[PDB]
Amino acid sequence: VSSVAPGKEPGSLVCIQAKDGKVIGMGARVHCGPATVLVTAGHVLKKGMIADLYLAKYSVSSKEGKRVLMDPTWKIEYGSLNKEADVISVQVPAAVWSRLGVTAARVRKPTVKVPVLAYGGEASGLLQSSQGFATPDGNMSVAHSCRPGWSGTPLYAGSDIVAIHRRWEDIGVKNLATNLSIFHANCES
Protein backbone atom coordinates (compact mmCIF):
# COMPACT_ATOMS: atom_id res chain seq x y z
CA VAL A 1 0.00 0.00 0.00
CA SER A 2 1.68 3.15 -1.38
CA SER A 3 1.25 6.79 -0.63
CA VAL A 4 0.72 8.84 -3.79
CA ALA A 5 2.25 12.29 -4.12
CA PRO A 6 -0.12 15.25 -4.23
CA GLY A 7 -1.92 15.62 -7.54
CA LYS A 8 -0.29 12.54 -9.07
CA GLU A 9 -3.47 10.50 -9.05
CA PRO A 10 -5.36 9.90 -12.31
CA GLY A 11 -6.97 13.06 -13.86
CA SER A 12 -10.40 11.36 -13.79
CA LEU A 13 -10.41 10.57 -10.03
CA VAL A 14 -12.52 12.47 -7.51
CA CYS A 15 -13.18 12.21 -3.83
CA ILE A 16 -16.70 12.55 -2.62
CA GLN A 17 -16.65 14.49 0.66
CA ALA A 18 -19.13 15.56 3.27
CA LYS A 19 -19.57 19.25 4.26
CA ASP A 20 -16.75 18.91 6.89
CA GLY A 21 -14.30 17.20 4.49
CA LYS A 22 -14.82 13.63 5.48
CA VAL A 23 -14.02 11.52 2.47
CA ILE A 24 -16.92 9.10 2.23
CA GLY A 25 -16.44 7.70 -1.25
CA MET A 26 -14.65 8.26 -4.50
CA GLY A 27 -15.63 8.49 -8.11
CA ALA A 28 -14.50 9.14 -11.62
CA ARG A 29 -15.49 11.04 -14.63
CA VAL A 30 -16.01 8.61 -17.55
CA HIS A 31 -16.86 8.90 -21.25
CA CYS A 32 -20.38 7.58 -21.66
CA GLY A 33 -21.35 7.60 -25.32
CA PRO A 34 -21.37 11.32 -26.45
CA ALA A 35 -21.05 12.78 -22.95
CA THR A 36 -19.37 12.13 -19.64
CA VAL A 37 -20.85 11.01 -16.36
CA LEU A 38 -19.60 10.68 -12.74
CA VAL A 39 -19.49 6.92 -11.97
CA THR A 40 -19.56 5.77 -8.34
CA ALA A 41 -21.26 3.42 -5.84
CA GLY A 42 -24.98 3.64 -5.26
CA HIS A 43 -24.54 3.81 -1.49
CA VAL A 44 -22.23 6.84 -1.65
CA LEU A 45 -24.72 8.79 -3.73
CA LYS A 46 -27.68 7.95 -1.38
CA LYS A 47 -26.01 10.01 1.30
CA GLY A 48 -26.37 13.17 -0.84
CA MET A 49 -30.21 12.90 -0.67
CA ILE A 50 -30.22 14.22 2.97
CA ALA A 51 -26.88 16.06 3.25
CA ASP A 52 -24.53 18.04 1.07
CA LEU A 53 -21.96 15.92 -0.71
CA TYR A 54 -19.04 17.65 -2.46
CA LEU A 55 -16.97 16.64 -5.46
CA ALA A 56 -13.34 17.31 -4.67
CA LYS A 57 -9.92 17.15 -6.26
CA TYR A 58 -6.47 18.40 -5.31
CA SER A 59 -5.36 21.56 -7.17
CA VAL A 60 -1.80 21.68 -8.55
CA SER A 61 -1.80 25.50 -8.95
CA SER A 62 -3.28 26.32 -5.56
CA LYS A 63 -1.54 23.43 -3.78
CA GLU A 64 -4.70 22.37 -1.97
CA GLY A 65 -8.07 20.61 -2.32
CA LYS A 66 -10.94 22.23 -4.22
CA ARG A 67 -14.56 21.20 -4.03
CA VAL A 68 -17.94 21.74 -5.65
CA LEU A 69 -21.32 21.08 -4.04
CA MET A 70 -23.24 18.16 -5.58
CA ASP A 71 -26.93 18.59 -6.51
CA PRO A 72 -29.05 15.58 -5.71
CA THR A 73 -31.36 16.29 -8.64
CA TRP A 74 -28.59 15.76 -11.26
CA LYS A 75 -30.07 12.93 -13.27
CA ILE A 76 -28.86 9.45 -12.55
CA GLU A 77 -28.29 7.71 -15.90
CA TYR A 78 -27.08 4.22 -15.07
CA GLY A 79 -28.02 2.49 -11.81
CA SER A 80 -30.50 3.17 -9.03
CA LEU A 81 -30.38 4.35 -5.45
CA ASN A 82 -33.69 2.81 -4.29
CA LYS A 83 -32.89 -0.90 -4.41
CA GLU A 84 -29.26 -1.35 -5.49
CA ALA A 85 -25.69 -1.44 -4.01
CA ASP A 86 -24.12 -1.69 -7.53
CA VAL A 87 -22.51 1.01 -9.72
CA ILE A 88 -24.36 4.25 -10.33
CA SER A 89 -23.68 7.19 -12.69
CA VAL A 90 -24.64 10.83 -12.66
CA GLN A 91 -24.90 13.59 -15.27
CA VAL A 92 -22.61 16.08 -13.60
CA PRO A 93 -22.51 19.45 -15.46
CA ALA A 94 -19.35 19.79 -17.48
CA ALA A 95 -18.86 23.19 -15.68
CA VAL A 96 -18.27 21.25 -12.37
CA TRP A 97 -15.59 19.00 -13.86
CA SER A 98 -13.98 22.09 -15.52
CA ARG A 99 -13.72 23.84 -12.15
CA LEU A 100 -12.23 20.73 -10.53
CA GLY A 101 -9.77 20.02 -13.37
CA VAL A 102 -11.21 16.53 -13.85
CA THR A 103 -10.56 14.91 -17.21
CA ALA A 104 -12.61 11.88 -18.30
CA ALA A 105 -11.34 8.38 -18.57
CA ARG A 106 -12.31 5.51 -20.82
CA VAL A 107 -13.72 2.08 -19.98
CA ARG A 108 -11.33 -0.67 -21.19
CA LYS A 109 -12.62 -4.27 -21.29
CA PRO A 110 -9.34 -6.04 -20.44
CA THR A 111 -7.99 -8.27 -23.23
CA VAL A 112 -5.25 -10.14 -21.28
CA LYS A 113 -4.30 -10.37 -17.53
CA VAL A 114 -3.39 -6.77 -16.62
CA PRO A 115 -2.08 -4.97 -13.51
CA VAL A 116 -4.55 -2.59 -11.78
CA LEU A 117 -4.20 0.27 -9.20
CA ALA A 118 -7.12 1.48 -6.95
CA TYR A 119 -6.96 4.83 -5.05
CA GLY A 120 -8.49 6.19 -1.88
CA GLY A 121 -7.64 8.04 1.35
CA GLU A 122 -8.50 10.79 3.80
CA ALA A 123 -7.91 13.94 1.80
CA SER A 124 -7.64 14.82 -1.90
CA GLY A 125 -3.92 15.65 -1.32
CA LEU A 126 -3.05 12.56 0.76
CA LEU A 127 -4.20 9.55 -1.27
CA GLN A 128 -2.97 5.96 -1.23
CA SER A 129 -3.00 3.18 -3.78
CA SER A 130 -3.38 -0.52 -3.73
CA GLN A 131 -2.20 -3.22 -6.25
CA GLY A 132 -3.85 -6.19 -8.04
CA PHE A 133 -5.00 -7.67 -11.41
CA ALA A 134 -7.77 -7.72 -14.00
CA THR A 135 -8.40 -10.95 -15.95
CA PRO A 136 -10.87 -11.25 -18.92
CA ASP A 137 -12.56 -14.18 -17.19
CA GLY A 138 -14.61 -12.14 -14.70
CA ASN A 139 -12.41 -11.36 -11.69
CA MET A 140 -10.75 -7.98 -10.91
CA SER A 141 -9.26 -7.22 -7.50
CA VAL A 142 -6.85 -5.15 -5.45
CA ALA A 143 -5.19 -6.29 -2.15
CA HIS A 144 -4.89 -3.98 0.99
CA SER A 145 -2.33 -5.84 3.28
CA CYS A 146 -3.05 -6.36 7.08
CA ARG A 147 -12.15 1.28 5.01
CA PRO A 148 -15.54 2.52 3.61
CA GLY A 149 -14.10 5.86 2.19
CA TRP A 150 -12.68 3.86 -0.76
CA SER A 151 -16.28 3.02 -1.83
CA GLY A 152 -16.89 3.60 -5.50
CA THR A 153 -13.30 4.18 -6.48
CA PRO A 154 -12.21 2.75 -9.85
CA LEU A 155 -9.67 0.07 -10.76
CA TYR A 156 -7.41 1.79 -13.30
CA ALA A 157 -5.43 0.13 -16.11
CA GLY A 158 -3.24 3.15 -16.88
CA SER A 159 -5.62 6.12 -17.31
CA ASP A 160 -8.42 3.70 -18.54
CA ILE A 161 -10.87 2.17 -15.97
CA VAL A 162 -12.08 -1.50 -15.79
CA ALA A 163 -14.10 -1.82 -12.57
CA ILE A 164 -15.52 -0.08 -9.54
CA HIS A 165 -14.76 -0.95 -5.93
CA ARG A 166 -17.84 -2.18 -3.97
CA ARG A 167 -16.21 -2.89 -0.53
CA TRP A 168 -13.38 -4.98 1.06
CA GLU A 169 -14.15 -8.57 2.00
CA ASP A 170 -14.59 -9.64 5.63
CA ILE A 171 -10.93 -10.27 6.55
CA GLY A 172 -8.15 -11.27 4.08
CA VAL A 173 -7.85 -7.68 2.53
CA LYS A 174 -9.08 -8.61 -0.95
CA ASN A 175 -11.39 -6.42 -3.02
CA LEU A 176 -14.84 -7.22 -4.39
CA ALA A 177 -15.40 -4.98 -7.46
CA THR A 178 -18.06 -4.60 -10.17
CA ASN A 179 -16.93 -5.48 -13.70
CA LEU A 180 -17.84 -2.40 -15.84
CA SER A 181 -18.88 -4.44 -19.00
CA ILE A 182 -22.64 -4.08 -18.44
CA PHE A 183 -22.09 -0.33 -17.75
CA HIS A 184 -20.04 0.14 -20.91
CA ALA A 185 -22.50 -1.62 -23.22
CA ASN A 186 -25.29 0.50 -21.67
CA CYS A 187 -23.20 3.63 -22.34
CA GLU A 188 -22.54 2.52 -25.93
CA SER A 189 -26.11 2.83 -27.29
Side-chain angles (χ1 to χ4, degrees), residues 1-81 84-145 147-166 168-189:
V1 169
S2 314
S3 291
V4 178
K8 294 291 163 196
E9 78 282 1
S12 67
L13 190 75
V14 290
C15 297
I16 289 153
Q17 295 168 1
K19 193 102 196 279
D20 62 22
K22 197 168 121 73
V23 177
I24 53 144
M26 310 283 294
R29 195 186 182 180
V30 292
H31 290 284
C32 184
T36 61
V37 291
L38 163 81
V39 54
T40 201
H43 72 269
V44 170
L45 195 59
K46 250 231 189 73
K47 277 140 191 122
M49 299 268 88
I50 57 169
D52 289 336
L53 298 190
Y54 286 84
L55 282 173
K57 202 177 169 66
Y58 172 88
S59 190
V60 280
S61 299
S62 330
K63 297 176 80 196
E64 55 159 302
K66 252 151 196 198
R67 57 165 37 185
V68 176
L69 173 63
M70 306 183 62
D71 187 328
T73 66
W74 295 331
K75 177 149 138 64
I76 97 87
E77 199 161 288
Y78 185 88
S80 168
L81 300 181
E84 215 137 56
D86 203 69
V87 308
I88 204 160
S89 65
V90 179
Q91 313 180 346
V92 169
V96 173
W97 301 125
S98 293
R99 284 167 65 206
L100 286 183
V102 188
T103 66
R106 296 257 164 219
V107 180
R108 180 172 173 39
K109 204 232 167 132
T111 199
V112 60
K113 196 213 184 74
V114 69
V116 303
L117 288 178
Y119 303 73
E122 269 175 8
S124 69
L126 309 174
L127 292 164
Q128 304 198 187
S129 61
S130 174
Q131 268 151 200
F133 299 100
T135 313
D137 32 300
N139 283 226
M140 344 230 172
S141 53
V142 296
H144 203 98
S145 307
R147 187 237 175 178
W150 281 50
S151 299
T153 200
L155 311 192
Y156 287 89
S159 61
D160 291 24
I161 278 168
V162 309
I164 295 298
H165 171 85
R166 275 157 51 198
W168 302 92
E169 227 283 87
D170 199 38
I171 249 49
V173 300
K174 355 69 146 289
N175 203 358
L176 252 45
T178 303
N179 190 351
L180 234 42
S181 66
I182 307 133
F183 173 77
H184 189 46
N186 269 249
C187 272
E188 211 104 79
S189 31

